[PDB]
Amino acid sequence: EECRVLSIQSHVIRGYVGNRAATFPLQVLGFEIDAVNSVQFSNHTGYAHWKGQVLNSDELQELYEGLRLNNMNKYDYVLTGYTRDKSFLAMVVDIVQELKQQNPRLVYVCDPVLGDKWDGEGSMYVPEDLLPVYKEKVVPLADIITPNQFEAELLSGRKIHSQEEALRVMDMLHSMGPDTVVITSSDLPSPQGSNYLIVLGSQRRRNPAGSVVMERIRMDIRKVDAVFVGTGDLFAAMLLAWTHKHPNNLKVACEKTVSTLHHVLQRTIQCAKAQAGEGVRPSPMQLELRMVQSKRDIEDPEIVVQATVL
Amino acid sequence: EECRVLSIQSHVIRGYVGNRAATFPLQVLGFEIDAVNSVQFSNHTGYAHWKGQVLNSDELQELYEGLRLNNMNKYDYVLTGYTRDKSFLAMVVDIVQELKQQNPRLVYVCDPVLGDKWDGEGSMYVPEDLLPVYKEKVVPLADIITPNQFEAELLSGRKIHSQEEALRVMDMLHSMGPDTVVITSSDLPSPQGSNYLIVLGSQRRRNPAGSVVMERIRMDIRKVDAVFVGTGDLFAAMLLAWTHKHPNNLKVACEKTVSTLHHVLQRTIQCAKAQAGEGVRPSPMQLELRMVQSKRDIEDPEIVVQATVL
Numbered sequence: 001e002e003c004r005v006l007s008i009q010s011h012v013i014r015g016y017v018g019n020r021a022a023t024f025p026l027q028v029l030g031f032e033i034d035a036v037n038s039v040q041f042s043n044h045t046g047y048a049h050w051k052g053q054v055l056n057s058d059e060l061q062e063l064y065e066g067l068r069l070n071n072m073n074k075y076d077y078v079l080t081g082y083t084r085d086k087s088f089l090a091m092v093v094d095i096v097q098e099l100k101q102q103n104p105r106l107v108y109v110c111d112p113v114l115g116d117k118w119d120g121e122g123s124m125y126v127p128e129d130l131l132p133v134y135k136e137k138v139v140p141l142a143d144i145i146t147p148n149q150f151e152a153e154l155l156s157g158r159k160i161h162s163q164e165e166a167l168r169v170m171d172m173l174h175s176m177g178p179d180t181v182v183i184t185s186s187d188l189p190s191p192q193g194s195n196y197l198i199v200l201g202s203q204r205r206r207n208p209a210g211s212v213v214m215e216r217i218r219m220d221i222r223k224v225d226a227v228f229v230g231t232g233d234l235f236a237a238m239l240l241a242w243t244h245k246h247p248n249n250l251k252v253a254c255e256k257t258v259s260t261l262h263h264v265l266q267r268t269i270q271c272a273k274a275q276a277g278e279g280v281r282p283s284p285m286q287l288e289l290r291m292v293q294s295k296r297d298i299e300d301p302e303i304v305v306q307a308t309v310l
Numbered sequence: 311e312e313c314r315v316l317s318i319q320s321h322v323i324r325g326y327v328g329n330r331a332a333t334f335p336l337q338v339l340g341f342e343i344d345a346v347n348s349v350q351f352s353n354h355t356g357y358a359h360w361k362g363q364v365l366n367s368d369e370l371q372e373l374y375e376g377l378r379l380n381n382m383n384k385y386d387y388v389l390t391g392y393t394r395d396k397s398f399l400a401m402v403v404d405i406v407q408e409l410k411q412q413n414p415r416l417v418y419v420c421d422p423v424l425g426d427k428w429d430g431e432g433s434m435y436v437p438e439d440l441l442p443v444y445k446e447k448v449v450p451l452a453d454i455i456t457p458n459q460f461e462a463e464l465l466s467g468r469k470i471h472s473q474e475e476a477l478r479v480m481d482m483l484h485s486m487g488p489d490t491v492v493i494t495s496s497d498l499p500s501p502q503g504s505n506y507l508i509v510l511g512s513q514r515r516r517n518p519a520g521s522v523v524m525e526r527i528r529m530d531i532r533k534v535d536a537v538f539v540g541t542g543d544l545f546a547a548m549l550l551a552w553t554h555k556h557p558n559n560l561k562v563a564c565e566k567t568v569s570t571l572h573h574v575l576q577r578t579i580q581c582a583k584a585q586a587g588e589g590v591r592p593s594p595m596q597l598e599l600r601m602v603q604s605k606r607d608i609e610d611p612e613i614v615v616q617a618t619v620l
């Protein structure tokens with residue numbers, strides 16, 4: 001009785017992004033998550049300053065060699081996110097692969113971090129020579145991917161202007177490999193305002209009888225006037241967690257994931273406003289996620305937003 | 311309204327030692343703990359194999375500069391443990407000195423890892439050139455130290471054959487600087503039977519009126535027939551937590567600390583035996599701390615041991 005996860009992400013001393021946004025939450029939910037830190041920086045790169053070291057593909061390979069020699073290369077899930085190096089990303093592919101040989105039932109949850117959009121136009125935040133690797137090597141191996149609108153577009157090659165185009169892109173993404181695709185954020189039109197960001201879910205699965213079916217969901221989340229870092233990593237981590245508990249219920253899984261984010265952010269923005277005054281926009285430091293103060297919400301998130309069925 | 315802790319210890323991918331044994335429990339208890347991973351290995355050195363890389367003193371300084379450049383050099387506590395390099399430890403002393411300059415109220419919890427004793431004879435397991443650094447620079451800075459019997463011996467130059475010699479050696483360490491000294495394990499005889507190890511605590515403090523008072527405690531812990539790794543790091547992390555919540559009550563802080571280790575170990579030995587099989591001695595892998603499954607015990611440990619005031 002234990003679920004083992006190998007998470008290969010960034011590590012920071014101060015703050016919560018990468019393995020720091022993902023680890024504590026999964027530990028609180030009872031997963032045996034082993035963290036491989038692809039980097040060690042003082043804090044995330046949205047700060048005015050930051051210093052640190054990165055891990056190269058050789059060292060990553062070296063670290064994996066250790067686990068293998070000890071016959072500890074048996075996981076239930078693998079989790080990856082922001083990766084800045086192509087050789088590193090390739091080594092990750094070689095690793096997930098072997099781990100999948102060892103355990104065919106392994107679920108590779110992949111957050112294909114490539115970039116995002118701002119105001120209107122989007123741009124990459126990672127080496128462009130990563131996109132082909134993700135397309136031909138990483139995604140075909142993935143079981144669950146969580147790209148944002150911009151990443152869904154780059155991966156599929158199609159731009160998204162409406163919900164129906166999103167769904168079509170999702171199907172394209174399903175054909176590339178993963179049975180679960182969740183667009184974690186988008187500027188799609190919303191009947192509630194425009195102050196809302198849209199989340200779209202799509203999961204294909206074989207039912208008991210053996211019929212292959214697909215469940216689709218949509219969520220309209222009201223925007224918080226501030227920029228957060230780590231929340232996508234958190235999103236992917238909780239999705240892993242909740243699909244694990246509700247494997248045939250994408251609706252409930254996403255509602256628990258999105259609600260956990262809501263409570264963490266609500267608490268985070270309250271503490272930030274007070275920290276740096278009335279009217280003052282909080283600094284990156286003050287906007288760090290109140291992760292430990294949110295233990296209870298992570299354990300049993302009260303559902304504050306139900307998804308609409310598609 | 312945070313209590314920030316800076317823990318500089320080792321990191322392993324699989325298992326619980328160093329920062330792996332200290333972070334989760336401190337996070338669970340509500341502390342904003344930031345982890346500097348002095349090393350990143352696949353697993354602890356108690357296994358037949360282990361690969362990984364170390365962090366050099368330049369890199370440690372580099373990371374520290376990132377924190378300083380951002381004004382994130384304000385901690386309430388600093389926690390250190392096993393260090394193999396003398397250069398690294400020196401750099402650590404310099405960092406603590408400055409952090410103390412930045413905050414005169416900072417509490418430095420030092421676990422002076424040097425070695426241990428297997429049935430009678432002691433043995434060091436880190437460079438011998440570290441003892442002077444510890445005696446001269448490290449311990450003088452520390453506010454709370456927690457050596458096992460052997461380290462306290464080395465640190466003082468005085469052999470411990472009984473409780474009262476242990477209390478005399480602890481009084482010597484207080485004079486070296488630290489106001490709280492806790493011997494985390496010893497060969498001392500117990501009126502409980504041979505199957506018991508002894509823990510001794512000593513706290514030098516000031517009372518309202520303004521006079522310096524001493525509190526001395528003893529605990530007889532039932533030995534578990536197995537070698538665990540990470541338990542000392544956990545002891546030091548939990549002693550930090552509970553002394554923080556119970557400032558002038560070494561007795562309680564120790565009862566909660568030792569009780570926590572008790573529940574964690576009872577759960578560990580049980581799962582280990584269930585895997586190894588009746589009669590069979592569990593392997594290191596099977597004895598890895600059941601940290602995540604012990605969350606509730608960490609939050610509020612049921613006191614299964616009462617400390618006797620000396």
Ligand SMILES: Nc1ncnc2c1ncn2[C@@H]1O[C@H](COP(=O)(O)OP(=O)(O)OP(=O)(O)O)[C@@H](O)[C@H]1O
Binds near residue numbers: 231
């Ligand atoms: N400003 C915000 N207001 C409200 N919710 C937000 C905000 N920022 C992030 N979130 C929450 O975090 C989730 C992830 O969004 P984010 O924009 O953080 O990740 P992404 O950009 O979607 O993922 P990634 O960059 O890792 O591929 C959103 O779906 C939402 O639930």
Ligand SMILES: Nc1ncnc2c1ncn2[C@@H]1O[C@H](COP(=O)(O)OP(=O)(O)OP(=O)(O)O)[C@@H](O)[C@H]1O
Binds near residue numbers: 531535537
């Ligand atoms: N075999 C065991 N049986 C019972 N308790 C144990 C056992 N091993 C460790 N412990 C628990 O761990 C605590 C610390 O002992 P350990 O021997 O683990 O650390 P130390 O050697 O005292 O510290 P360090 O090695 O970090 O300087 C003990 O006080 C006890 O609570």
Ligand SMILES: COCc1c(COP(=O)(O)O)cnc(C)c1O
Binds near residue numbers: 017044046229231
């Ligand atoms: C600008 O990148 C910040 C960042 C994030 C942000 O994730 P998100 O909160 O935008 O989802 C994750 N990992 C690392 C290492 C990061 O540096």
Ligand SMILES: COCc1c(COP(=O)(O)O)cnc(C)c1O
Binds near residue numbers: 328539542544
């Ligand atoms: C023999 O030391 C094992 C070990 C510990 C043990 O702590 P303890 O369980 O003996 O208290 C801590 N950190 C590293 C890197 C270690 O390798």
Ligand SMILES: [Mg+2]
Binds near residue numbers: 116185
């Ligand atoms: Mg975004």
Ligand SMILES: [Mg+2]
Binds near residue numbers: 081082113232233
């Ligand atoms: Mg990310």
Ligand SMILES: [Mg+2]
Binds near residue numbers: 458495
């Ligand atoms: Mg010991």
Ligand SMILES: [Mg+2]
Binds near residue numbers: 392423542
């Ligand atoms: Mg130790």
Ligand code: NA
Binds near residue numbers: 147185
């Ligand atoms: Na995403």
Ligand code: NA
Binds near residue numbers: 421456458494542
């Ligand atoms: Na000790």
